[PDB]
Each structure stands twice: as structure tokens, then as C-alpha cells.
């Protein structure tokens, strides 16, 4: 029944339209959903704009009108010029005449702000098409009508606000460069009259709604107008005094003054300097007298959230931080400006105590700007000693757990602040620590906050002041732990103590006996069943080791052995109560220490002893697994095997090239284990179906394979002896992994195989051309068939596939020359397939592969393979690239699509393609590829975008080819074309813009 409005054979039933609108907005459920689908179909009808005349004239529903202005809006923006000009006259005059009819009706001008705003914006769309060339009296008539009515004068401010936005703020993406500059020039040359109307309304009052709408438009003007309209009039005095008084105008006026603190102003005139000081003095005066004094508790005010207090305090922080970062040097020399400068910063201090993360980040950014300047600029830090002293407390008390971005910002400000006054910082911190022990501020959150603060300033004090500070801090922290009862308390204190010491390696390195006692405690802590202690002890251990490794590898005075030997000897007892993942962290730490030993025989012996336990379990299993593979069905055995390999990955991660001896001990049996595991995965999917890949049993077997590939990848990525890589490792690896991947069903293939092969080609690809050929043959076609039916399935194989092709195309392009012509054709298809992905990991590599392939072909010179490549694939690459550039579904790849396109076009205009790109029949003989390239492109665009004129297509290509050595201009010309294909009747002269 509701679908009657969709029939344009009959005449519109306005009453039937008002109901389906009301059923959509005020309704619910199925009838709302159905009214939605008909209102979309109605507005989407290409003839609906015709019936917009009578909807907006006879309907009583404001939503129905609004919708019809949308229908109009789509017509004005996209098909305006295609209309017979009589319709352009009618829509124009209807839209204007309505706007005044709504303005004069005080009833409607107050109850239908949404509709009047939509009508103003629709008018602005017409002005983008018609003004000023076919409407040069708009601005003079706008100023004339303003004196007639306060309501039309206010609405004119709205029209001017919207006009300035469409022209200057949101034009770069929505119109051509030429059309934007035309509108910017037009507004620029008639602004003198607009400003006087704006300044008169502000100066003469008195309607607050009219003053606010004029201040809102002024906010938009300040983005672009020249300095003189602000500093050569009285307007700074009005903004900084009169309008800071009323709260109706205070919010907009603050935003205006914030923009003014960013205007382009000559830094040598001292009058403008006094005008910049004066509006700041006035603004701060109005705040202190009409809003709140500098002592006010902005923390509590913000938390109460009365009215617009939150928005106001946000705007105050934006105003102060913006102005002071640019102009505070204007206040630092004159003694009469010193109170104004410190009051401004004292307001920031109070703003900085508000519990509001995003606001705090805004103030923190300014504090960073300030303390950085006091750290470098002479004679400045004494001005702010009391501001800085308060800031230290604010930052120490709001320290966050090391968002990590916020923490790093807090650490940087606090390190600066500590260098500016080391003595103040220490006194605050010890003071806060005392009140942690006397119980006045004792809290789990408050002791953590303080430890982070103390830990964050490491490396900023003198080594001997640091030594006494660290000693004092550890001492009080331990007396805090003893005083506390219960586990959950004594666990958090003891954790912070370990976090602090982990932050002070310069202290640990100078006092071995202390460092030794630390590590011994972490070892005791690796048996504490209380949750978090074990994870804490392991993280601190590897953290300290990274910094102090040299002190574990040497033999310290009055010890018989390097402490590493002591750690390794008791490793089984030390880690006996840790989870596997924590055991691997422990071994990784030991690997860090061992790699610091540069005597090869000592290093290898340390490596042999560290790996004793996993090597013994390995040897046992490989003997029991081979005789005979029923053991690998046991869940416990695959877990033990997985953890042995993970242990090897962990030690290999920290030891890199030095891990080679331990790899050689297990390598041949590990690849054998890889083959055996592979058979059982295959046997299981055959016996149970594809669902077997989801079972714990097979997920555990695939874990073994993945960890084996991760170990080999980890080593090869860090190996320094590549001769051993190729001659010892690569051949058994490929035999073990390539055929198994190729001959498995898709669901049983491990994408890690591709990732491992990418690393092999990356490191030693130049040394194994027959190996790279064997990798392609075994993974190229069978992986492509997995991923070329949609953009969804096998997401990991998709990403690794194109990383593999990318490095092969970089390192051993010879492999693609050996592909049979049918397989090379799939390679080109695979590249373009990557273009069409929305997934960024695939799209970026696909564009990069295409670019690198073109350069690979160009480097071959005038040879048959390069000539045949262009004959077969040049226009495929040109048109596939044009397709993703123009379909609006791959905007994230614009820059690299443009780069590729220009490379393809420049090839022809530099005559690097030796053969003709056409068939001998279709074009006369001797015609340049350049002439044929323009013909192919003109024909291609004409059929793809039939609504473009031949002159548009011809002016676009003329500009594009001429600009194929200038990426920034080329891109601007592509952007202009992307705009023109969205409408009808685009001006072809636009492409002469550059």
C-alpha cells in the first residue's frame, strides 16, 4: 500500500508521502523498515527532482521537504549543466524565494532550523555552479536584504558560513583545481563587502542569535582571510572583551581567538605584537572576572559537568596551549607581562588536573613544548620555576602504566623537568614515598603510579646522586613490604621493587653483589604460586639481562665462574614451576647472555649446556618417535615436541648467527620429524575429512610444523654465513616442505611455508636460482587457485603469496623468465588480481610488484622477451590500473596507482618500447606508439565513461601525457578527472590548470 508514491505514471499524493515519511522517522519495526526501502527508491528515482517543486510547496511535513532538497541536491551537484537552462532558472528562483518565505515567518524560522539550514546548503550548491559568472549581484543583494530583517540577516550569515566552507574547507576533494581557484578568487575579491556587514552586525548588537551566527561565520573566514581584517580593525577588541562576557557568544569567540592565534602575521612589526598581547590580556581578564579565578578547582568543575562547562574547559585549554606555543616569548621579556604569563600557565596547571584522558594529552603536548624550550633556551627556565614545580607533582600523580604512547609522553616531560631541577624532583618523590608508608596515601594504584614515576626518570641524575636515590628508594620499598600483611599486598609492593630496579641498569652494573642478589630473588619468585609474580620475575629477568649481559658473561671479582654458568647449572630447578611460555623467555634471556661471549669455543660450550635438557628430551623422543610413529598420536608427546622446538626458537631469537651449532645438532632429525608429522596430518584428514584440521590432535601436529618453519626462518633471517645456508640447509629444507605443500588439500596447507620461503629467497635468493624456480613451481599455481575465487578465503595464504612473489620479482626475476608462457600469463593475472583487493597487505604489494616488473622488463633492453611483454601485457596493465583508479573502491591505493600509471605512460613518451603496440592492420604504418596510446585511451575511456564528451577525454589525456614526469601534477590531474566523472558537463579547460 505504501508503494503508491513510487508510481510516477499518476500524480504525487503528498498526503501519502507524508505518512511513509512519518512511518520511517516516528515509526518502528517492519513498517519502518519497509517505509525506508520505499523512500530510498523514491529519492533514487532519476525523475524525483521534478516533483520536488510541489513537495516543498504543498507538504506540511518538514522531513518530507528536507528529503526533497536532498533529491534536488543530487541534481544540482551531478546533472545541473545537463538540464535545459529553463529548469536551472526555475530551481534557482524557487530555492531562493522559499528561503525568504521561511525567514519572514517567525513561527517557522524558529521551529524548522533543520529545514532552513538544508535550504541554505542547497542554495550554496547552486552558487558553486552559477556564481559569480551568472550571478554577480548575489553578494550585493545579500548585503541589501540583510538590513530589512534580523531573521534574513542571520540566515545570510549561515549562507555565508556554508559558502566559505564549501569553497575553502571542503573543496580539495570535491571540485577540480580550476573550479576551486575560481571560487576562492571570487570570494576573495568580494570579501571587503562581506566583512563590513559582519563587523557592523557585531558592533551594533543586539540579537544574540544574530551575533552568534555572525561569529560562527567569522570562525570560517579566519581560516583564509588576510591578516589586515583582524589587526587593522577593532575586531580583536570586540572578541576579547565584549563577546567573552556573554556565555551565548563565549564558546564561538574562544574558537575565533584560537584561530587568530594561528593567522599569518609579520613577526617584525611591534604594533601587531602589542595587538597579539592585548587580546590575550583581555581574554584572560574576562575569564578571571566572568567565569572563574585561577585558583578555581577545574578538576571538580569538569567532573560536575554542569551545562557546557566541559566544552568550555576544553576550548580554554585549546586556546591557551595554541596561543602560548606560538606567542609566549611576547610575554617573557616585559616585566609588566609577567603576571599575565604565569596566570595563563597556572590555568593550564589547573586544567592539567582534570580526569579526562584526551584533555590531559592536549595539555601534556604543550608542557612538552614548554619544558623542551626551557631545556635549550638560555635565561628562560627561571621564569617558570613555580609552574614547573607544580607540573612535577601533576605528572608524578597521573603516571600511567608503562596507553604506552601516553606513558612515553609523560616520561619525556618528566625527564626534562628532572634535568631542570633535579633536587625538586627527588624531594617530591621521597615525600610521596613517605606518605605511602605512613598510610595517608597508601593504595595499590598509588604505589604503582609512584614506582612508574621513579622508574621513568632513570638516567637523568648523576651516577652518584642516582646511587643514593636508588638505595633510598629500594630501602623504603622493602620496609613497605614487611609492614604489609596478606599476599595480595606483599605481591604488589615486591613487584614494584622489581620494576624500579629493572629501570636502573647503570646502578645494577656498578654493584655486582647487589645485581646478583636481585636475580637470585627473581629465581625464588619463579616458584611463587601467587598469580602475576612468575610473569613479573621472568619479564624483569630478561629486561635486566638485556642491559647487564656483560656482567653475567665475565667472571666478576671474587667469583670462580661467570654467573651464566651458575644460572645454566640450576636451570631445571629454577624454572621447575613456570609455564612453558615462561620457560622459553628464561632460555631466551640465557641466549642473550651467551651471545656476549665472543670466544667461539666458550660460546658453543655455553650453548651446549643451556640446550642440555631440551636436547635430551629431543634425543629421547626422536628415538622413540621413529620406533615407531604411533607415539605422535599421543597429545602429550606432540606437546613435549612443540615445547622443545619453541625453546629452540626462543634461544635462536636472541642468538641469531651464533645459534648455528645447536641448529646443526637437530636439523636433519627435525626435517624428518616434519615429514612424519606431515603424513599423519594427511592420514587424519583422509580418515576423518576436512573437519580433522579443527581437532586438537591435528592442530597440535600443525603446531610442530609451524614451529619448525619458524625456527628455520628465524635462523636464516639472521645468518651471517650464507654459504652454509645454501650448501647445508636449503636443499634438505625444500625437499621436506615444497612437495608436501603442493600435494596437500588447500585446507591442510600451511601459509607459514610461504613465509619461510620468502625469507629464504630474501637472504640467499641470488645464490639458488634453481631453488627459486623449484619454489615457484611448487607453490605458485596451487596457491593462486586457492585465492582467485574471491577476496575472502585463505587470508593468510593471500598475504604471504604476494610477499613471496614480491621478493622473487626483486631477487630472482630470472625465475619468471623460465615460466612457460601460460604460467607467466597467470603471473600477470595474479598481479592485477592483487590490484582489486581492499585488503591493504595485498593491494600494496600487488602495485609494487607491477611497478618492479615493468622496471625488470625495461632493464632487459630491446630483446624478444621485453618486446613480447609489451605486445601482450602493456595495455592490460594500463587499463587494469585505470580501472582501480576510477571505480571509487580502491581510494587507499591512489598514490601508487598513479605512480604505476605514470611509469607506464612515460615508457611510451620516452620511446623505450621498441616494437609497435598495435596490430599492423588496425593503424597505418609508421604511426608512433604515442599516437596509438592516445587513441587506445580515448576509446577506452569513451566506452567506460560514456557521459563524458570527446573534448573532456581529449583534454584530460593531453594534460596527463604531457605531465608524466611530474608526479604531483599528474596526481592533481587524475584527481580532477575523478571529480569530472562524477557529474555531467565538466569543463575540459580544467585540465589546463597546471
Amino acid at each position: 500500500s505504501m508503494e503508491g508514491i513510487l508510481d510516477f505514471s499518476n500524480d504525487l499524493d503528498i498526503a501519502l508521502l507524508d505518512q511513509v515519511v512519518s512511518t520511517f522517522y516516528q515509526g518502528s519495526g517492519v513498517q519502518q523498515k519497509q517505509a525506508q526501502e520505499i523512500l530510498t527508491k523514491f529519492q533514487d528515482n532519476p525523475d524525483a527532482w521534478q516533483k520536488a517543486d510541489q513537495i516543498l510547496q504543498f507538504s506540511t511535513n518538514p522531513q518530507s521537504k528536507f528529503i526533497a532538497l536532498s533529491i534536488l541536491d543530487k541534481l544540482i551537484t551531478r546533472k545541473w549543466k545537463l538540464l535545459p537552462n529553463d529548469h536551472r532558472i526555475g530551481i534557482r528562483n524557487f530555492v531562493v524565494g522559499m528561503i525568504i518565505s521561511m525567514c519572514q515567518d517567525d513561527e517557522v524560522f524558529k521551529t524548522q532550523k533543520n529545514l532552513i539550514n538544508k535550504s541554505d546548503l542547497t542554495l550554496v550548491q547552486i552558487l558553486k555552479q552559477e556564481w559569480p559568472q551568472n550571478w554577480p549581484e548575489f553578494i550585493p543583494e545579500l548585503i541589501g536584504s540583510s538590513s530589512s530583517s534580523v531573521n534574513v540577516c542571520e540566515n545570510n550569515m549561515i549562507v555565508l558560513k556554508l559558502l566559505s566552507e564549501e569553497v575553502f574547507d571542503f573543496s580539495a576533494e570535491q571540485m577540480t583545481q580550476a573550479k576551486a581557484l575560481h571560487l576562492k578568487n571570487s570570494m576573495s575579491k568580494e570579501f571587503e563587502q562581506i566583512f563590513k556587514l559582519c563587523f557592523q552586525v557585531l558592533e551594533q548588537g543586539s540579537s544574540s542569535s544574530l551575533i552568534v551566527a555572525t561569529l560562527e561565520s567569522l570562525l570560517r573566514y579566519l581560516h583564509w582571510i588576510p591578516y589586515r581584517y583582524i589587526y587593522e580593525t577593532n575586531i580583536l577588541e570586540l572578541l576579547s572583551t565584549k563577546f567573552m562576557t556573554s556565555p551565548d557568544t563565549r564558546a564561538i569567540t574562544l574558537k575565533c581567538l584560537t584561530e587568530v592565534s594561528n593567522l599569518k602575521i609579520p613577526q617584525d612589526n611591534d604594533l601587531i605584537k602589542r595587538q597579539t598581547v592585548l587580546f590575550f590580556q583581555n581574554t584572560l581578564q574576562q575569564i578571571a572576572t566572568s567565569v572563574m579565578p585561577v585558583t578555581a578547582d577545574l578538576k571538580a568543575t569538569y567532573a560536575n559537568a554542569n551545562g557546557n562547562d566541559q566544552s568550555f574547559l576544553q576550548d580554554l585549554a585549546m586556546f591557551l596551549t595554541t596561543y602560548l606555543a606560538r606567542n609566549r616569548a611576547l610575554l617573557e621579556s616585559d616585566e609588566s607581562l609577567r603576571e599575565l604569563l604565569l596566570n595563563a600557565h597556572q590555568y593550564l596547571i589547573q586544567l592539567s588536573k582534570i580526569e579526562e584522558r584526551e584533555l590531559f594529552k592536549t595539555t601534556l603536548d604543550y608542557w612538552h613544548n614548554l619544558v623542551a624550550d626551557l631545556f635549550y633556551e638560555p635565561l628562560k627556565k627561571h621564569i617558570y620555576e613555580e609552574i614547573c614545580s607544580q607540573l612535577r607533582l601533576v605528572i608524578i600523580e597521573n603516571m600511567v602504566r608503562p596507553t604506552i604512547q601516553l606513558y612515553k609522553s609523560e616520561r619525556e616531560v618528566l625527564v626534562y623537568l628532572t634535568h631542570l631541577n633535579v633536587i625538586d624532583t627527588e624531594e617530591i618523590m621521597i615525600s610521596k614515598l613517605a606518605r605511602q608508608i605512613d598510610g595517608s596515601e597508601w593504595s595499590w594504584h598509588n604505589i604503582n603510579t609512584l614506582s612508574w614515576a621513579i622508574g621513568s626518570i632513570s638516567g637523568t641524575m648523576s651516577e652518584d646522586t642516582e646511587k643514593r636515590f636508588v638505595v633510598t628508594v629500594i630501602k623504603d620499598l622493602l620496609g613497605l613490604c614487611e609492614q604489609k600483611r596478606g599476599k595480595d599486598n606483599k605481591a604488589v609492593v615486591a613487584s614494584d621493587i622489581m620494576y624500579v630496579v629493572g629501570q636502573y641498569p647503570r646502578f645494577l652494573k656498578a654493584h655486582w653483589n647487589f645485581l646478583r642478589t636481585v636475580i637470585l630473588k627473581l629465581f625464588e619468585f619463579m616458584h611463587e604460586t601467587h598469580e602475576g609474580v612468575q610473569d613479573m620475575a621472568c619479564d624483569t629477568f630478561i629486561k635486566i639481562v638485556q642491559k647487564c649481559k656483560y656482567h653475567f658473561v665475565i667472571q666478576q671479582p671474587r667469583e670462580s665462574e661467570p654467573f651464566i654458568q651458575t644460572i645454566i647449572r640450576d636451570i631445571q630447578k629454577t624454572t621447575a614451576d613456570l609455564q612453558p611460555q615462561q620457560v622459553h623467555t628464561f632460555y631466551k634471556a640465557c641466549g642473550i647472555i651467551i651471545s656476549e661471549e665472543r670466544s667461539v669455543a666458550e660460546r658453543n660450550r655455553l650453548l651446549s649446556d643451556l640446550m642440555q635438557l631440551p636436547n635430551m628430551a629431543w634425543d629421547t623422543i626422536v628415538e622413540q618417535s621413529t620406533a615407531n610413529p604411533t607415539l605422535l598420536l599421543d597429545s602429550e608427546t606432540v606437546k613435549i615436541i612443540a615445547n622443545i622446538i619453541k625453546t629452540n626458537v626462543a634461544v635462536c631469537t636472541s642468538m641469531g648467527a651464533d645459534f648455528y651449532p645447536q641448529l646443526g645438532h637437530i636439523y636433519y632429525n627435525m626435517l624428518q620429524l616434519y615429514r612424519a608429522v606431515s603424513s599423519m596430518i594427511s592420514a587424519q584428514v583422509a580418515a576423518e575429512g576436512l573437519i580433522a584440521t579443527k581437532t586438537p590432535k591435528v592442530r597440535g601436529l600443525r603446531t610442530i610444523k609451524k614451529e619448525i618453519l619458524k625456527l628455520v626462518e628465524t635462523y636464516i633471517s639472521k645468518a651471517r654465513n650464507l654459504d652454509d645456508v645454501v650448501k647445508v640447509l636449503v636443499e634438505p629444507l625444500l625437499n621436506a616442505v615444497l612437495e608436501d605443500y603442493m600435494n596437500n588439500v588447500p585446507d591442510a596447507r600451511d601459509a607459514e611455508v610461504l613465509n619461510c620461503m620468502t625469507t629464504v629467497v630474501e637472504k640467499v635468493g641470488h645464490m639458488i636460482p634453481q631453488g627459486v624456480i623449484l619454489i615457484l613451481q611448487s607453490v605458485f599455481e596451487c596457491t593462486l587457485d586457492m585465492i582467485n575465487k574471491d577476496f575472502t578465503e585463505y587470508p593468510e595464504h593471500r598475504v604471504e603469496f604476494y610477499k613471496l612473489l614480491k621478493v622473487i620479482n626483486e631477487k630472482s626475476f630470472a625465475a619468471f623468465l623460465e615460466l612457460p608462457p601460460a604460467a607467466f600469463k597467470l603471473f600477470v593475472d595474479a598481479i592485477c588480481w592483487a590490484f582489486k583487493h581492499n585488503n591493504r597487505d595485498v593491494e600494496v604489494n600487488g602495485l609494487q610488484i607491477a611497478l618492479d616488473l615493468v622496471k625488470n622488463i625495461e632493464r632487459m633492453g630491446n630483446v624478444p622477451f621485453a618486446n613480447e611483454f609489451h605486445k601482450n601485457y602493456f595495455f592490460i596493465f594500463v587499463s587494469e590500473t585505470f580501472f582501480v583508479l576510477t571505480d571509487s573502491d580502491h581510494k587507499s591505493g591512489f598514490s601508487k596507482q598513479a605512480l604505476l600509471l605514470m611509469k607506464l605512460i612515460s615508457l611510451v613518451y620516452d620511446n623505450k618500447i621498441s616494437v609497435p603496440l598495435y596490430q599492423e592492420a588496425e593503424v597505418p604504418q609508421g604511426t608512433s606508439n604515442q599516437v596509438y596510446l592516445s587513441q587506445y585511451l580515448a576509446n577506452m575511456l569513451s566506452n567506460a565513461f560514456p557521459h563524458l564528451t570527446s573534448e573532456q577525454i581529449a583534454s584530460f589525456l593531453s594534460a596527463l601525457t604531457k605531465q608524466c614526469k611530474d608526479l604531483v601534477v599528474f596526481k592533481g590531474t587524475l584527481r580532477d578527472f575523478l571529480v569530472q566523472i562524477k557529474e555531467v558537463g565538466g569543463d575540459p579547460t580544467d585540465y589546463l590548470f597546471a
Binding site: 622493602l478 642478589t517 630473588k521
Partner: peptide, 15 residues
């Protein structure tokens, strides 16, 4: 007072 904190670390406990 380094040997002092040191001895205190040693006694660090949770029980």
C-alpha cells in the same frame, strides 16, 4: 648503605 638494602632484598618475602 648498599650492603644494607642488599641484605633486605635477600629477606624479601611474601609469606
Amino acid at each position: 648503605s648498599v650492603e644494607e638494602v642488599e641484605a633486605g632484598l635477600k629477606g624479601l618475602k611474601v609469606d
